[PDB]
Amino acid sequence: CKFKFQF
Amino acid sequence: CKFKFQF
Amino acid sequence: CKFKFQF
Amino acid sequence: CKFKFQF
Amino acid sequence: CKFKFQF
Amino acid sequence: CKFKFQF
Amino acid sequence: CKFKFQF
Amino acid sequence: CKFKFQF
Amino acid sequence: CKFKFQF
Amino acid sequence: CKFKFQF
Amino acid sequence: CKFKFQF
Amino acid sequence: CKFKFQF
Amino acid sequence: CKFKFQF
Amino acid sequence: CKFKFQF
Amino acid sequence: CKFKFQF
Amino acid sequence: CKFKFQF
Amino acid sequence: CKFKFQF
Amino acid sequence: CKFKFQF
Amino acid sequence: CKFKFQF
Amino acid sequence: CKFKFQF
Amino acid sequence: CKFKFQF
Amino acid sequence: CKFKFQF
Amino acid sequence: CKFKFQF
Amino acid sequence: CKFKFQF
């Protein structure tokens, strides 16, 4: 919801 | 919802 | 929910 | 929920 | 540097 | 450096 | 360095 | 270095 | 905090 | 905190 | 903390 | 803590 | 020099 | 030098 | 030098 | 040198 | 602090 | 601190 | 601390 | 500490 | 001539 | 001539 | 001539 | 000439 960081 | 950062 | 970091 | 780091 | 985000 | 996030 | 996250 | 996370 | 410097 | 420096 | 330096 | 240095 | 900070 | 910090 | 910190 | 820290 | 001289 | 001289 | 001289 | 000289 | 500091 | 510091 | 520090 | 420190 707040922060979604995908690599 | 707030921040979505995708790499 | 807060932070999701996937490598 | 908070931090999910997968390698 | 490329991205500099300060919250 | 490429990404610099400061919370 | 590539990612620098400071919480 | 590649990832530097400081909590 | 008192100081947040993103160089 | 008192100081947060992201160099 | 008093100091958080991410070099 | 008093010092957290991530070099 | 590049930076002179007298705190 | 690059940095001179007198705390 | 690169860094001179007088704490 | 690269670092001179006088604590 | 009492005296702060920056040259 | 009492005297802080930065040259 | 009493005297802090940085040259 | 009483005197801190950094050259 | 330039600076005279006496304690 | 330049700086005279006496304690 | 330059710096004279006497204790 | 440069620095004279006497204790």
Residue numbers in the entry:
A (entry chain L), B (entry chain F), C (entry chain R), D (entry chain X), E (entry chain E), F (entry chain K), ...: 1 to 7
Give me lines lifted from the publication on this model.
To address this issue, we have used cryo-electron microscopy (cryo-EM) to determine the molecular structure of an amyloid fibril that is formed from peptide PNF-18. This 7-mer peptide (sequence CKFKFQF) was artificially designed as retroviral transduction enhancer and increases HIV-1 infection rates of TZM-bl cells by a factor of more than a hundred-fold.
We achieved a spatial resolution of 2.86 Å, based on the 0.143 Fourier shell correlation (FSC) criterion. There were, depending on the position of the peptide stack in the fibril structure, three topological types of peptide stacks (α, β and γ) that were arranged into pairs, which we refer to hereafter as PFs. The peptide conformation is kinked and shows two chemically different sides: a hydrophobic side that is formed by residues Phe3, Phe5, and Phe7 and a polar one that is formed by the side chains of Cys1, Lys2, Lys4, Gln6 as well as the N- and C-terminal groups of the polypeptide backbone. The peptide’s amphipathic properties lead to two modes by which two peptides (or cross-β sheets) may interact within the plane of the fibril cross-section: a hydrophobic and a polar contact mode. The hydrophobic contact mode occurs between the two type α peptide stacks and between a type β and a type γ stack. The polar contact mode, which occurs between type α and β peptide stacks, involves an interdigitation of the side chains of residues Lys4 and Gln6, similar to a steric zipper. Only the peptides in stack γ, which are bound through the hydrophobic contact mode to stack β, adopt an angle of almost 45° relative to the fibril z-axis. Morphology II shows a strongly cationic Coulomb surface potential, which originates mainly from the side chains of Lys2 and Lys4, and the α-amino group of Cys1.
